[PDB]
Chain A
Amino acid sequence: ERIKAERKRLRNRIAASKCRKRKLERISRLEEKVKTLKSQNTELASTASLLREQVAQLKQKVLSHV
């Protein structure tokens, strides 16, 4: 009977180990994804700011020539 308890305990510990491993993998993958997305959003935000500036200037020119 004791062997059954030891075996269920072993199975539990194994499932816990593999769960922790997969969880850490997911967390790492998500962290990388967040970093990448932040970089891309920085480049995109800067591009958008520059474009808004350029559009504002162009509008200023069109108006000045009225």
Chain B
Amino acid sequence: ERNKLAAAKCRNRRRELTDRLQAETDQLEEEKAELESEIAELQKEKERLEFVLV
């Protein structure tokens, strides 16, 4: 029970820094994944069009 309060009280301290950094990490991971899907889709479209011209 003493280590529960020790760890909880520990993490509650100045947790706003780690929360800002972790949130930013989340946004950047999502933006990353969606950018990757956009790149794949755009490459498929590019190959398609190039096929169309010929």
Contact = CB atoms under 8 A, between A and B. Distances in A.
Interface of A: 15, 19, 22-23, 26-27, 30-31, 33-34, 37-38, 40-41, 44-45, 47-48, 51-52, 54-55, 58-59, 61-62, 65
Given A23-B10, A27-B17, A41-B28, 18 more contacts: A19-B10, A27-B18, A30-B18, A30-B22, A30-B25, A37-B25, A37-B29, A44-B35, A45-B35, A47-B39, A48-B35, A51-B46, A52-B42, A55-B46, A55-B49, A58-B46, A59-B49, A61-B53
Contacts of B49: 55, 58-59, 62
Interface of B: 6, 10, 13-14, 17-18, 21-22, 24-25, 28-29, 31-32, 35-36, 38-39, 42-43, 45-46, 49-50, 52-53
Contacts of A19: 6, 10, 13
B18 A26 contact: yes
B42 A51 contact: yes
A29 B13 CA distance: 18
A65 to B, nearest CB: 7
